[PDB]
Each structure stands twice: as structure tokens, then as C-alpha cells.
Swiss-Prot record, chains A, B:
Keywords: Bacterial flagellum, Cell outer membrane, Lipoprotein, Membrane, Palmitate, Signal
Self-association and partners: The basal body constitutes a major portion of the flagellar organelle and consists of four rings (L,P,S, and M) mounted on a central rod.
UniProt name for this protein: Flagellar L-ring protein
Residues included from the entire protein: 59 to 116 of 232
One Gene Ontology cellular component annotation held by this UniProt entry: cell outer membrane
Origin organism lineage: Bacteria, Pseudomonadati, Pseudomonadota, Gammaproteobacteria, Enterobacterales
Compartments reported by the entry: Cell outer membrane; Bacterial flagellum basal body
GO molecular function: cytoskeletal motor activity
Family membership noted in the UniProt record: Belongs to the FlgH family.
Entry function: Assembles around the rod to form the L-ring and probably protects the motor/basal body from shearing forces during rotation.
Single GO biological process annotation from the record: bacterial-type flagellum-dependent cell motility
Length: 58, 58
């Protein structure tokens, strides 16, 4: 004797020892990315190629 | 016995121990960028290639 068994209810595990099918379908995909940058360029110049006479002391 | 179980309400977790499915879907993307620049160019010239006689002292 197996006890009350339903007639229209789906066949589910109910007690200890009942078997159940597991469809293993795992798909995990995690990602991360990052970046940082900095730049700085400078040029300076001053040339008195021909100095006038009133400014040759400076 | 499991207590009052609704019939048309969706199957939600209500008490401690109930299971809930989480669909992990994260998509975060932050960005920032900036720049600055400056420039300055100068030329000056004066040439008395042929100096007139009344101006040869200056």
C-alpha cells in the first residue's frame, strides 16, 4: 500500500525518497573593465634674434 | 499543514525560508573626459635696410 495518490495532479515528489529530474542549465557571465589617463604638455620660448640698441642692456 | 494559501495570487515569497528567483542583469557604464589647451605666438621685426642720411643718427 502506497497511500492516497492523486489522479489529475502532476507527478511531483512529496515524501522522502521520491525522485525528481533536474535540468542543469547554468550560464553565468560577469565582466568589468575600467581605465584612466592624464596628459600635460608645455613649451615656452623667447628669442631676441636681433636686439635693438636701446634694449641691449635688458 | 501549511496555512492559508491563496488561489489566484501569484506565487510570491511571504515568510522566512521561501525561495525567489533573481535574474542577475547588471549593465553599468560610466565615463568622463576633459581637456584644455592654450597657445600664444608672436614675431616682431624692424629693419632699416637703407637708412636715409637725415635719419642715420636715429
Amino acid at each position: 500500500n502506497y497511500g492516497y495518490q492523486p489522479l489529475f495532479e502532476d507527478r511531483r515528489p512529496r515524501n522522502i525518497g521520491d525522485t525528481l529530474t533536474i535540468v542543469l542549465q547554468e550560464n553565468v557571465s560577469a565582466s568589468k573593465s575600467s581605465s584612466a589617463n592624464a596628459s600635460r604638455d608645455g613649451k615656452t620660448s623667447f628669442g631676441f634674434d636681433t636686439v635693438p640698441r636701446y634694449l641691449q642692456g635688458l
